[PDB]
Design a protein around this ligand. Structure first.
Ligand SMILES: NC(=O)c1ccc[n+]([C@@H]2O[C@H](COP(=O)([O-])OP(=O)(O)OC[C@H]3O[C@@H](n4cnc5c(N)ncnc54)[C@H](O)[C@@H]3O)[C@@H](O)[C@H]2O)c1
Ligand SMILES: NC(=O)c1ccc[n+]([C@@H]2O[C@H](COP(=O)([O-])OP(=O)(O)OC[C@H]3O[C@@H](n4cnc5c(N)ncnc54)[C@H](O)[C@@H]3O)[C@@H](O)[C@H]2O)c1
Ligand SMILES: NC(=O)c1ccc[n+]([C@@H]2O[C@H](COP(=O)([O-])OP(=O)(O)OC[C@H]3O[C@@H](n4cnc5c(N)ncnc54)[C@H](O)[C@@H]3O)[C@@H](O)[C@H]2O)c1
Ligand SMILES: NC(=O)c1ccc[n+]([C@@H]2O[C@H](COP(=O)([O-])OP(=O)(O)OC[C@H]3O[C@@H](n4cnc5c(N)ncnc54)[C@H](O)[C@@H]3O)[C@@H](O)[C@H]2O)c1
Lengths: 344, 344, 344, 344
């Protein structure tokens, strides 16, 4: 056999350091121990290992936090489609129990939480044809369906609030911004199933720099005809979110998806020279040079994540991953959170 | 041989309709006829066929347009990373020659066009480690590099302009919005290599609902300490972009990337019950239910693309695709555009 | 407000049919009921809903099966990297308990199961540089590491077996094929942690048309110098796998990943005019026209999946998804499987 | 303004080294100079820059080659769907003019080249429903269509050849392997539009370890009933491809797509301790730990690409990219290739 071929293929290797962990998956001969099955993800490899790390990182944020400021300010960011899905429930649970500090989402992420209190969203199919659905006034969101009557109901609900918002702006001197508006709609919806109802109630601010890119925008638009003058300033909200990072004792970032939401949170944390913890769950890829698809390491070069931080990115659909992450982290510390509130 | 196996595998088929086109790629035995090679993409299959269709669709927008209003209002949308790349040149060419009507981009998409007039962006690698780059103050964007000194220069350049913007707001009654600001910075940069210099000059509006999510935002933030009060209203800009769709004789949408940009343009066109032409070039996928990754058909269900329109989506990095699309469309009609301006 | 704008945006919609299911995620206020949390994936939307469907489809295969033939022949296919990961354990569990009928994997999928009985694979990082690792003789597989000494040990282990295989071929008339070889190596490894040890023991055939594309191939190659003549025929294995589909009472397909494995299983089922059940878990996309990235519906056009079947594709990394699918399906029916074997 | 905030954001940076290249895209004010537009991809960034590098790397392989052995043995690998597309023409052009040395493809990649000489493939849509198409006996491949009558014609064409192949095996002692078979079918098809007709004619071997995974396999299967005994050995083909790498003066790898094809070529080059040049064009991602989605650097850790080589991976659909790469490389050196053959 060719010598060089043998040498190339049969190259010797010294052993790895003792610290090395072996790949090993959950053994179902033990039966189904869900906690152990989930912990086994850590040694399963690929994205399973990253999920395992995300659980450790989020648990570290929480532990730091349990040591109005807290020991660690957690920013929770998500894209609109996640509020359309059932992840809306998971997010509402975290906010209801004051487990995160700052929320930032896109317009869809705001409006659809309120609308779900008015009418439901349904399961559909990715394959459903647009023409046929439009003839029925049904809007398609992935494999989910939002009947357009939902937005008609949203309009009926919202208009009276916009009348009052412009009145208050003009007679009471109110300076409206996306966060102030979102807090208002949250108080107005007055429904325990609402993310913003709870955020408003727990004084957790919600940032959304492009609040006008959606249904709420359409309503603001039409309403501006009979009642012109409403102003939504994005500058004041910039100061608010940035100062939360700046004066935080320590920060963690839990970001689902990419775009403005992801970038906006990481830019705020650059103001303090980087977040101390960062966990991402998104399906974007880096090859196109997009910010949305950038590995957490690129954020390190910008100084948005501390050079000594251990950021984790899980490549996967959050609808699948987020509830499992919450089950193994926040949900496992309910007593600790309550204890901090004097309820345990 | 098993009968049912034979029947299943050897199932007969009638012939396809005469209208059917055969798959066939460019024959290099002809040598290199670039125009024919590009036209051959149409019958090559997969994304090549979609690129071929995108060329036909954009050419249709242009032809309709050549028949202050024009016969077809073209909205050009792009994400920030594309202005970081050399596609910034392609976009500036289209705007310089008044070939598109409305532009919408994200914050990075605005600021980096101006900054490139102050200092350049360089080629780097996706692999460059964040820690090492940060120790040098180098920001990484995909396989591109933006030295942080660039933003320091941006700050020196921008501050005087922000002083004047707040002065004008307070003594001259100016109501600032993202588009008005972008037009101002474009006039200020006064450089022929600037996209916004040309947009401002050709009265092509630029929308950017989250103009604060970036460097310009950081500068607005810091500046607000010595000179507080600047207001950036996103509501008035909503009326402006929506009315462009509403009063357009016909519309076309050329969108690179996804996120707010893509959604914002399609929402404006819903105001006229859908765009007449739509071409997309992005790398997002639909499985995660994201708006960014939605096939053009989902937009049809919302009524953002006319049910009778033939939208085209090319799955590919625009840095590769866009210059070829411009070469085969707009660049092929320079004389026609000039003719409309009485220069031919 | 513009009339047509209002009409377009405020289009009415009738209600959806009563059969419609509402999107709703798990409510953590209930605490952590893992079974309910997993069942809630079904109404969470996006890939979570598809995972929910995959569980229902696999449970249907199993139920049909529990009604040497069985009521439903399940083909289990997987790519090499999944045997490198801890999913190797999940697969071995299914095979150990005779829960699937036919296995098909690539070369890596065969050899690495045997090698893990000789030396372990470790956790590494996607970021580890190739040059540095090669200087140490460490092979990188995603975020996993395979020290090259592992293959040296594999060679020491395999050579004696290859000597015997060629002897038997030449003096005992044995006609070697990939499946016969894999069964032999499985018997030889004689380790309860081995997938092929169990397959061989439970008479579950393993197909691998390109068994030579890997380490086993390198060893076959070098060995052919001192002991030439070994023949591995891929034709006989074709008859074997095809006849399993043809004479099956009913079939189900559980495929992880794409490529040859996925295509080979679906082609065998075309021989019976399509599989009755099909569940896929892979991360491939359809835009490039690849077979690996084709939606299950394309398989329907070929007649590889029955037109009346309800195939499910989950877009996600199987290292994350497969153990959860097994927990909710096969692992929940251990007693039923044992009952069929007279052990309950 | 907060000091630490200013320090973090306004961090100074020294200038980059003089060797740094600036990002800059093609300026269409020059008109359309296709050669310059393509060369400009190099400084455009993202995948455009990688395409630019792929052109330089392939040109280096060719230059080395122009210095039966040649100075550089080029392995050309591609997946089946690319032969279904018009890229079949591009590949046939390279083979017709003896520009590559070894070809390796999957089963579909072999059979569909032959079938296209019998009947054409057509343009369809990704959206075409499987049920409807199957009722018509039309097979769907991405946005392409293959009428099933094509395979019926393939069967009529192939059977006589298989009768002879088994006759020759049994009376003339022929030992069949995938490469020997493919050479035979190539000679048999006797059509200048056939890739394998030209490969056979130019003595360019074609490897395909899973030649049975497709239509040719179905035909081999059915034929084995009346004429049993045909043997296709994959071991001898292993020696052939490996020795091409081993005894090559220098090697280059041009791989389109992933899977067996990609892995098989890189494994052969490991026999010589790595390929000297490597260019890849595929859409696979690394996150799932797949070999198909591995960055070229992982191949370096295995020693399949020389540690001192500059491999290039372009993330994009090859139907779009490959013809442009050939236009800028091989097609630009036709005279040089002919010169080496004494035709110039
Ligand atoms: N998507 C909707 O349902 C919806 C509804 C109303 C308005 N909008 C508008 O669309 C704009 C853009 O949307 P976003 O909401 O900005 O971005 P998308 O455009 O919603 O998502 C951006 C990126 O986030 C990642 N992502 C999306 N869903 C994910 C998931 N399930 N798991 C993990 N990663 C995921 C993907 O990488 C994607 O490319 C919003 O600003 C909003 O104004 C969207
Ligand atoms: N990316 C930057 O360089 C940069 C710079 C400054 C600020 N920002 C901020 O980041 C926010 C989010 O970015 P965007 O700019 O909103 O989105 P990304 O988050 O820039 O891109 C969103 C989606 O667009 C698609 N896309 C990206 N690049 C593409 C390409 N080359 N070809 C085709 N498709 C492509 C992808 O599917 C991607 O998931 C901006 O609003 C901005 O404020 C980004
Ligand atoms: N990958 C390895 O570790 C390895 C080891 C030895 C040999 N090989 C050789 O490489 C060849 C090609 O590999 P395969 O093994 O054929 O294909 P890959 O090339 O292993 O995977 C092919 C496709 O499967 C899907 N996929 C991969 N991993 C996945 C995951 N974690 N979850 C879901 N989907 C996933 C992806 O869409 C991917 O593009 C094999 O035939 C084998 O001979 C590979
Ligand atoms: N795809 C077909 O038309 C077809 C036809 C007959 C038989 N088959 C069988 O399917 C098996 C698997 O197919 P392959 O042919 O092995 O792999 P695919 O499974 O054809 O492709 C594998 C990977 O290659 C990459 N890829 C595919 N098309 C690409 C493109 N246009 N540009 C760049 N990258 C691309 C992708 O990352 C993909 O995940 C073959 O071995 C063959 O036996 C396929």
């Amino acid at each position: 056999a060719p010598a060089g071929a043998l040498a190339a293929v049969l190259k010797h290797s010294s052993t790895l350091p003792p610290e090395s962990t072996q790949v090993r998956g959950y053994d179902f001969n033990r039966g189904v121990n869900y906690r152990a099955l989930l912990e086994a993800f850590g040694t399963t490899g690929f994205q399973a290992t990253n999920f395992g790390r995300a659980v450790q990182q989020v648990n570290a944020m929480i532990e730091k936090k349990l040591e109005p400021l807290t020991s660690c300010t957690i920013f929770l960011g998500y894209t609109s489609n996640l509020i359309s899905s059932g992840i809306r429930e998971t997010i509402r649970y975290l906010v209801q129990h004051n487990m995160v500090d700052v929320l930032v989402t896109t317009a869809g992420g705001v409006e659809e939480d309120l609308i779900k209190c008015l009418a439901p969203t349904y399961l559909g199919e990715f394959s459903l044809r647009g023409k046929e659905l439009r003839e029925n006034g049904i809007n398609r969101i992935g494999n989910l369906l939002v009947p357009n009557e939902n937005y008609c109901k949203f309009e009926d609900w919202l208009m009276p609030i916009l009348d009052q918002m412009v009145m208050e702006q003009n007679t009471e001197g109110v300076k409206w911004t996306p966060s102030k508006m979102i807090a208002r709609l949250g108080k107005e919806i007055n429904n325990p199933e609402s993310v913003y109802y709870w955020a408003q109630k727990n004084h957790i601010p919600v940032f959304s720099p492009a609040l006008t890119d959606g249904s709420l925008g359409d309503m603001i638009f039409f309403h501006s005809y009979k009642n012109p003058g409403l102003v939504l300033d994005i500058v004041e909200d910039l100061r608010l979110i940035n100062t939360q990072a700046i004066f935080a004792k320590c920060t963690g970032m839990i970001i689902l998806g990419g775009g403005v939401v992801k970038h906006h949170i990481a830019n705020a944390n650059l103001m303090r020279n980087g977040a101390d913890y960062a966990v991402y769950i998104n399906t974007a890829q880096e090859f196109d040079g997009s910010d949305s698809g950038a590995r957490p390491d690129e954020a390190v070069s910008w100084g948005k994540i501390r050079v000594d931080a251990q950021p984790v990115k899980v490549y996967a659909d959050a609808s699948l991953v987020f509830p499992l992450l919450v089950a193994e982290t926040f949900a496992q510390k309910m007593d600790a959170f309550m204890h901090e509130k004097n309820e345990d």
